[PDB]
Tab-separated table of C-alpha atoms and ligand atoms in Angstrom:
chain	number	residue	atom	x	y	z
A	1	UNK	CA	-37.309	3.628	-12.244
A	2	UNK	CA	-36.300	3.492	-15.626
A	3	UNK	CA	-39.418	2.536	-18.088
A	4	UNK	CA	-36.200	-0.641	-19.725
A	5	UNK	CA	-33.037	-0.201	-16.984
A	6	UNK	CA	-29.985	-0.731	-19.358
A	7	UNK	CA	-26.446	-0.551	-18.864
A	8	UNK	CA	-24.391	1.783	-21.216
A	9	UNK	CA	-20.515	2.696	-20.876
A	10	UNK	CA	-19.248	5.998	-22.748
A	11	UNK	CA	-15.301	6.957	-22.743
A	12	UNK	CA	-14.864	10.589	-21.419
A	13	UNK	CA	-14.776	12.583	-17.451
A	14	UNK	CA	-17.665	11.553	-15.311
A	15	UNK	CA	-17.672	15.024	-14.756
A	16	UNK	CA	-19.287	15.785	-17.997
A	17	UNK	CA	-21.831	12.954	-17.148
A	18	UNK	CA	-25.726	13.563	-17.856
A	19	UNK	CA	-27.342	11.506	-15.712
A	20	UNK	CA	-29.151	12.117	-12.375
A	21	UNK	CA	-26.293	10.922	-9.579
A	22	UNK	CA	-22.781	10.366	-10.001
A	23	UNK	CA	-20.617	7.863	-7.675
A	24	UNK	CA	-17.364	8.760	-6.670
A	25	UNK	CA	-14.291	6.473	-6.794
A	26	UNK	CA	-13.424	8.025	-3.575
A	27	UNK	CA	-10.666	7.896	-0.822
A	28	UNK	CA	-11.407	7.097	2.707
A	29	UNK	CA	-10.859	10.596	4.523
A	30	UNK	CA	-12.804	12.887	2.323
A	31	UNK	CA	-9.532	14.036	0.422
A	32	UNK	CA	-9.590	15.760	-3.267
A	33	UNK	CA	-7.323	12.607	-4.011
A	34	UNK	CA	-6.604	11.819	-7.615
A	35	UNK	CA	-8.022	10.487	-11.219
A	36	UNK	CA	-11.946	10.371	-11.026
A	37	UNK	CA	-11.554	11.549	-7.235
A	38	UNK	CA	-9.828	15.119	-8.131
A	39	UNK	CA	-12.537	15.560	-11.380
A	40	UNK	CA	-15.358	14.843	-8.988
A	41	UNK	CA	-13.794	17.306	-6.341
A	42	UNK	CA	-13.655	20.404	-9.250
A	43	UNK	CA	-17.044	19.736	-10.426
A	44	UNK	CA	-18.652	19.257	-7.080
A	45	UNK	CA	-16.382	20.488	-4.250
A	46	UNK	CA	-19.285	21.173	-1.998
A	47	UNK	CA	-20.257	16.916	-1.908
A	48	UNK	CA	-16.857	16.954	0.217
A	49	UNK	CA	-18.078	18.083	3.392
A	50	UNK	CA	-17.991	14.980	5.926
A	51	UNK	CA	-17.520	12.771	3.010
A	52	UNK	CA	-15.454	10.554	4.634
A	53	UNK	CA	-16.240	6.740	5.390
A	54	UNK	CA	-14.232	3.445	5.874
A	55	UNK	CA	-13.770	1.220	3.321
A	56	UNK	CA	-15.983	-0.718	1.873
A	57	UNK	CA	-19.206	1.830	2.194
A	58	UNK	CA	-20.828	4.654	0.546
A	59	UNK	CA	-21.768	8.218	1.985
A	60	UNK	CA	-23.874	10.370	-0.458
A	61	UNK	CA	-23.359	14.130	-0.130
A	62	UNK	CA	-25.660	16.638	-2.129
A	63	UNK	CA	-23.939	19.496	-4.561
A	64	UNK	CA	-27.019	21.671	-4.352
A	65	UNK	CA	-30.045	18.888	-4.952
A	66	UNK	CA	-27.215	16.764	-7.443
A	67	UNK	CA	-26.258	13.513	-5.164
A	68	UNK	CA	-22.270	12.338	-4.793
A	69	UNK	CA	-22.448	9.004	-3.666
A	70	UNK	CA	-18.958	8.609	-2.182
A	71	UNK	CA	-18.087	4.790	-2.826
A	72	UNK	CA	-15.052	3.824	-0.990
A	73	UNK	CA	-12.908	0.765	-2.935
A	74	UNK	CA	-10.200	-1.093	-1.251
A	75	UNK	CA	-6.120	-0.263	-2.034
A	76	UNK	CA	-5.141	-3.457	-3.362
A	77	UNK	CA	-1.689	-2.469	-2.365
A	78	UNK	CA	-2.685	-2.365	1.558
A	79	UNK	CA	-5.139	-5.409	1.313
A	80	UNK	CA	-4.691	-9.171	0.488
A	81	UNK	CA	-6.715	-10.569	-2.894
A	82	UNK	CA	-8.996	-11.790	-0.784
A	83	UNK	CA	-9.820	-9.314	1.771
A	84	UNK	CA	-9.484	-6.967	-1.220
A	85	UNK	CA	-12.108	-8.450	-3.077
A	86	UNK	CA	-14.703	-8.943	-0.290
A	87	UNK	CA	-14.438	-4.998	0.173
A	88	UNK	CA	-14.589	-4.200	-3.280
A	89	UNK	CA	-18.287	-6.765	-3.266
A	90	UNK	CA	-19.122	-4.581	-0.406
A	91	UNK	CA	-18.866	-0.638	-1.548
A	92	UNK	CA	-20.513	-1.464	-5.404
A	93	UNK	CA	-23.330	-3.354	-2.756
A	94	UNK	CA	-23.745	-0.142	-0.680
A	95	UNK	CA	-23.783	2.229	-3.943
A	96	UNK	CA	-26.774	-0.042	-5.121
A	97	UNK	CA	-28.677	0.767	-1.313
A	98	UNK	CA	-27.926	4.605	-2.078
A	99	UNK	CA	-29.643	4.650	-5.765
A	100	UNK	CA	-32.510	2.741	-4.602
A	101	UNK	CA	-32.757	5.012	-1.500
A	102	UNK	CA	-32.638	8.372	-3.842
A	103	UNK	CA	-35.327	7.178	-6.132
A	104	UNK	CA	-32.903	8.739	-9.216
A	105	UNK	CA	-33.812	7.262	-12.851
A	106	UNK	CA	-30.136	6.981	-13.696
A	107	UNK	CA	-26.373	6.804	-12.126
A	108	UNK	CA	-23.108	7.672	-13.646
A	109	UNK	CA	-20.883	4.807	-12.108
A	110	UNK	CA	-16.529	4.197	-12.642
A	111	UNK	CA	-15.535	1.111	-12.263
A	112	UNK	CA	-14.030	1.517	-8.419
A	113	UNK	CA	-10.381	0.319	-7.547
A	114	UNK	CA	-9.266	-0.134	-11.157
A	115	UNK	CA	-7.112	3.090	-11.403
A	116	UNK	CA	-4.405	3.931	-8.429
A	117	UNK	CA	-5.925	1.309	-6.131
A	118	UNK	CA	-5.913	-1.049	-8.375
A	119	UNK	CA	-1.791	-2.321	-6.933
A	120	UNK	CA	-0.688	-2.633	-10.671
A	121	UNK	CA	-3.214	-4.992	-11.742
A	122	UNK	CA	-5.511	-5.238	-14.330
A	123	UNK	CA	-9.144	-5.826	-12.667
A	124	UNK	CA	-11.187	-4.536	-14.889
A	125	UNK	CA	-13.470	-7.952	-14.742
A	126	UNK	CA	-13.315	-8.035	-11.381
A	127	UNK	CA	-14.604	-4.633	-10.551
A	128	UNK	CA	-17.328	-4.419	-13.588
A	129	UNK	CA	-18.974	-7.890	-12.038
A	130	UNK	CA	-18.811	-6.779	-8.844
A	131	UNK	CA	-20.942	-3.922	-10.264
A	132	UNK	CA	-22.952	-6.187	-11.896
A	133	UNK	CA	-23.575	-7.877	-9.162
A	134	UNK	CA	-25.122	-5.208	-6.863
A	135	UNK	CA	-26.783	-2.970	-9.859
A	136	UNK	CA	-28.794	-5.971	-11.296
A	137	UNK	CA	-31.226	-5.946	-9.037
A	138	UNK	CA	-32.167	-1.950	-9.479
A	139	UNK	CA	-34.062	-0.324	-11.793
A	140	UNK	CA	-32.124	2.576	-12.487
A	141	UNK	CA	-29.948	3.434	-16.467
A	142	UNK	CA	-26.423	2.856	-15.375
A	143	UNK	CA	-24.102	4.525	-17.196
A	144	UNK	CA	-20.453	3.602	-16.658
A	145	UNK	CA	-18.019	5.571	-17.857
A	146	UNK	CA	-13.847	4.883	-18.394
A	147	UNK	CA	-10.903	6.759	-20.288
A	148	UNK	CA	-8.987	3.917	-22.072
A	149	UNK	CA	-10.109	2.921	-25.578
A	150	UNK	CA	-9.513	-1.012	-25.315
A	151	UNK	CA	-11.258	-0.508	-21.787
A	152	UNK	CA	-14.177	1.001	-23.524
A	153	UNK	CA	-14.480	-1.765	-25.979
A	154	UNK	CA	-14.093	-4.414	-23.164
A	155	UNK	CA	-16.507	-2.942	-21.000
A	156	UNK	CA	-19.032	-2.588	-23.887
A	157	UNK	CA	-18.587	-6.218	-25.057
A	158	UNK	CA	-19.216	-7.088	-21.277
A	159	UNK	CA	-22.427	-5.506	-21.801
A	160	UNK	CA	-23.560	-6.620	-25.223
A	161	UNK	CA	-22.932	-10.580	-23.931
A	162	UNK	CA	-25.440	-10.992	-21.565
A	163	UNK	CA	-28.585	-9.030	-23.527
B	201	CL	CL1	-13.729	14.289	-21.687
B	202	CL	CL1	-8.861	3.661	-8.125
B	203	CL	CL1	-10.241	3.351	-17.872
């Protein structure tokens, strides 16, 4: 673990991350898909073979040794608030089971369900303490990473509150 587990958030591709796993913001059936989905996919095309897992888990794939956990978030345009939300809990819950299980120092985590599957809504909030919530508990640097400058200083405040 790490020797004081912190949370950081930096605004740029996840693709460019530096630390030891990266989580994908991924799409059911394995696809390329789009936003963080399609970056991950050009960066790490290999992590896409049998990929694919309902939603609400994680399936990590290896890019040589480099892990791709594959975190499935709900649609919020197919799925009530509520049903929605319990799903969303559930794949930032399995991500937390795949870092412990990989023994990595550090994770490069989006924040899952906030871009296309987010049905027009604003849930940045919602999806950061949902990662809260499951990443607590581990002992690994999470570093979460975003592309809008008010989300960056949003997330970052988030952050800064509860040290
Ligand atoms: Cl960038
Ligand atoms: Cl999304
Ligand atoms: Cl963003």
């Amino acid at each position: 673990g790490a020797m004081a587990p912190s949370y950081r958030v930096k605004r740029m591709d996840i693709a460019k991350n530096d630390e030891e796993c990266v989580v994908n913001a991924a799409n059911p059936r394995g696809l390329p898909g789009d936003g963080v989905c399609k970056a991950v996919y050009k960066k790490w095309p290999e992590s896409f073979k049998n990929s694919a897992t309902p939603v609400g888990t994680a399936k990590t794939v290896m890019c040589g040794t480099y892990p791709v956990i594959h975190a499935v978030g709900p649609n919020f345009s197919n799925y009530t608030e509520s049903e929605g939300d319990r799903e969303l809990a559930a794949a930032y819950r399995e991500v937390a089971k795949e870092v412990t299980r990989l023994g990595v120092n550090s994770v490069a985590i989006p924040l899952l369900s906030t871009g296309v599957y987010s049905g027009g809504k604003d849930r940045l909030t919602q999806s950061l303490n949902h990662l809260f919530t499951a990443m607590d508990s581990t002992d690994a640097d999470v570093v979460i990473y975003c592309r809008d400058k008010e989300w960056e200083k949003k997330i970052s405040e988030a952050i800064q509150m509860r040290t």
